[PDB]
Every structure is written in structure tokens, then in C-alpha cells.
């Protein structure tokens, strides 16, 4: 009959009446200073004003939708959006799923690589909010980076990029894959995280025509404790001052869409660092709703509906 389809995010305000909500919700319920607000409202101003990611992740997760529902006859899937830091919440989502009579949900994160501070959380929220209502029993998805589509996805943008760069100037093209840093203690228990993503790069760069890459981190948080380095900033730095290449090609992997993460850490200071060292910047496109990124979650969701 009808599975519900749990697609999670972590939002992002509507208008810019909602950062200062925002920041204290990802600050675990602490008001952070007029400081530390005018800093995030700049960077929002920064990219535009806001940032799309509240229209790309509703396409995203209705174009999973229509893509699971188009491709088969077995079960009708209904897509339910939960978002981690802005309502409609995780709780939300599972509250509007119980109360249509869903029974059965498989809940995927917008991200294809798990961490405990991330889909764990994101996990834990929704099992936990399903267990205080009754219903629905969600079967989550934990990570869906080994989907052989989702690395040809990147590939592609990546050697569509590479190809308009100079022949003679390729050998000094270099690949940047990164994510969303974490603070470092979560390599001290062999959290899957930094390895989800050196498999990730490893995966990407065998099938592109960039002969050298590098891994790293970006938008580490405001807190007192080692995070997950190198910092791509400091990444491009130390690999001019190596090997002076040309052309630096960003892909943050870790990612699923151009958002204020990736249109200002990446769009701004990146392109700062590569303008300092006289190199050219490039980012291929974020996945965002195109039909092929459809088709890896089409696929993944599928692939987890039949193994239950
Ligand atoms: C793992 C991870 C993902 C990827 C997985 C996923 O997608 O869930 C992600 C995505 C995103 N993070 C986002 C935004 C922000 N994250 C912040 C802060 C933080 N993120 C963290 C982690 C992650 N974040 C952590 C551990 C903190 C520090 C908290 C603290 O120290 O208490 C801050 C505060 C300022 C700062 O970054 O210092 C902002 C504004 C947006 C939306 C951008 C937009 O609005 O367009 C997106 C997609
Ligand atoms: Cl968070
Ligand atoms: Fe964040
Ligand atoms: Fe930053």
C-alpha cells in the first residue's frame, strides 16, 4: 500500500527573521551572541540575502517521490520532510506520518556519509519520536555513498570540468574532495566518517581524468577542540607552496546541494585562496534536483525497500 518516505536535511531559515532561531537550535537551545549573529547574517548576505537550500531540498525530496513512484507498481511511496535545525522538524515529520496512517517509512538523510554527529543524530531523533507516538517503524537508511551511481554522478561533473581546462595545464589540476568538518575526537573511536570520505575520493578518482586530488575538511565550527583537518583553505595553501598547480577543482562530496556551506565556503574563501596564489577556481555543480542525483536516490531507496 503506502510507505512513507522520511527524507531528512538540515534546513535553513526562510527569511531572515529566522537565523537568530536557527543558530540557537543548532546551538543546542544557546542563544549565541549578536556577534556571532552578525557574522552568520553577513555570510547569508554574503551568498545573495538566503540560501536555496529550503527550494532544493523540497524538489529533492518530491522529485524522489515522483522518481520512486514512476519506476514501479509495488508500493506507493509518500515523501515526508524533516529537517533537523527548522521546522517542520524530525518530530514533525514523524508526527505527520503517524497521523496519515503511515505504518512502515524508510527514512534517508541528505548526506551519503554517516557520522555520529550527523545521521546518527538525525536517526535518533526520528526512531525516538516514533516510539513516543506508536508508529510509524522507520527503517533507516545510514549511508548511501558506495552507490556506484552516486560516484559516477561526481566523476561526470568533475571530467565535464577537467575537459575545458588546457591540455598542457591538466598535469597541474588537482581535485579537492571534502565534507562538513567534525571535532577530530570522533577518529579516537573509529567513527566510519573520515573513512566514508577517503573511499569516497579514492572511488572519484580513479574514474576521472584529474591526475592528483587531495582530501579535505571545511566550515569547522566555532568551538574549543581540534576538528577534522586539513581545512581546504589551508589544504590549498600547502599544495601551492608544494607543487604550484594551476587549476583547483572543489567537490564537496560531503554535500548534496549549493547551499550557504558550499556558496560561501567554497565559493568565497576558496576562491580567495586560489586568487592569492594566482591559480584558477573551479566547483563543478552541486547535485541539487537533477534527474541523474534523482536517479541515485531512486535507486537507494529501492534497494533498501526490497532487502525489508
Ligand atoms: C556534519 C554536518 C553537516 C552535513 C550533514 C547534514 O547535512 O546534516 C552540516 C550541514 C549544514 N550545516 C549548515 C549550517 C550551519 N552549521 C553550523 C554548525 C555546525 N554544523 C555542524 C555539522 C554539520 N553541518 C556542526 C558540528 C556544527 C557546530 C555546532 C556547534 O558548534 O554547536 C552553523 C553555525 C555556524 C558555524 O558553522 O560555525 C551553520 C549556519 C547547513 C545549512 C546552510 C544553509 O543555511 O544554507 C548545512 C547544509
Ligand atoms: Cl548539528
Ligand atoms: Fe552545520
Ligand atoms: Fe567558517
Request: charged share 30%.
Amino acid at each position: 500500500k503506502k510507505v512513507g518516505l522520511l527524507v531528512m536535511a538540515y534546513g535553513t531559515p526562510y527569511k531572515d527573521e529566522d537565523i537568530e532561531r536557527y543558530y540557537t537550535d543548532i546551538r543546542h537551545g544557546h542563544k549565541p551572541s549578536e556577534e556571532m549573529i552578525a557574522d552568520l547574517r553577513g555570510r547569508y548576505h554574503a551568498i545573495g540575502g538566503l540560501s536555496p537550500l529550503a527550494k532544493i531540498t523540497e524538489a529533492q525530496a518530491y522529485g524522489l517521490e515522483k522518481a520512486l513512484n514512476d519506476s514501479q507498481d509495488e508500493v506507493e511511496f509518500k515523501a515526508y520532510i524533516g529537517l533537523k535545525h527548522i521546522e517542520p522538524f524530525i518530530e514533525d515529520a514523524v508526527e505527520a506520518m503517524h497521523k496519515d496512517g503511515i505504518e512502515e517509512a524508510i527514512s534517508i538523510v541528505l548526506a551519503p556519509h554517516y557520522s555520529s554527529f550527523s545521521v546518527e543524530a538525525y536517526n535518533k531523533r526520528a526512531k525516538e519520536a516514533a516510539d513516543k507516538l506508536g508508529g510509524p517503524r522507520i527503517n533507516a537508511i545510514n549511508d548511501w555513498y558506495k552507490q556506484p551511481k552516486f560516484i559516477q554522478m561526481w566523476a561526470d561533473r568533475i571530467n565535464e570540468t577537467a575537459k575545458q581546462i588546457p591540455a598542457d595545464e591538466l598535469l597541474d589540476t588537482v581535485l579537492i574532495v571534502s565534507a562538513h568538518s567534525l571535532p577530530e575526537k570522533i577518529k579516537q573511536h573509529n567513527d566510519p566518517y573520515p573513512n566514508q570520505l577517503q573511499e569516497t575520493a579514492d572511488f572519484i578518482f580513479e574514474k576521472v581524468v584529474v591526475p592528483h586530488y587531495a582530501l579535505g575538511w571545511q566550515s569547522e565550527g566555532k568551538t574549543g577542540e581540534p576538528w577534522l583537518g586539513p581545512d581546504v583553505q589551508d589544504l590549498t595553501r600547502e599544495l601551492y607552496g608544494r607543487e604550484k598547480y594551476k587549476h583547483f577543482i572543489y567537490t564537496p562530496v560531503g554535500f548534496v546541494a549549493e547551499h550557504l556551506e558550499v556558496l560561501y565556503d567554497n565559493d568565497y574563501e576558496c576562491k580567495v585562496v586560489t586568487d592569492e596564489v594566482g591559480a584558477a577556481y573551479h566547483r563543478p555543480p552541486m547535485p541539487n534536483s537533477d534527474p541523474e542525483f534523482l536517479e541515485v536516490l531512486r535507486t537507494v531507496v529501492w534497494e533498501k525497500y526490497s532487502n525489508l
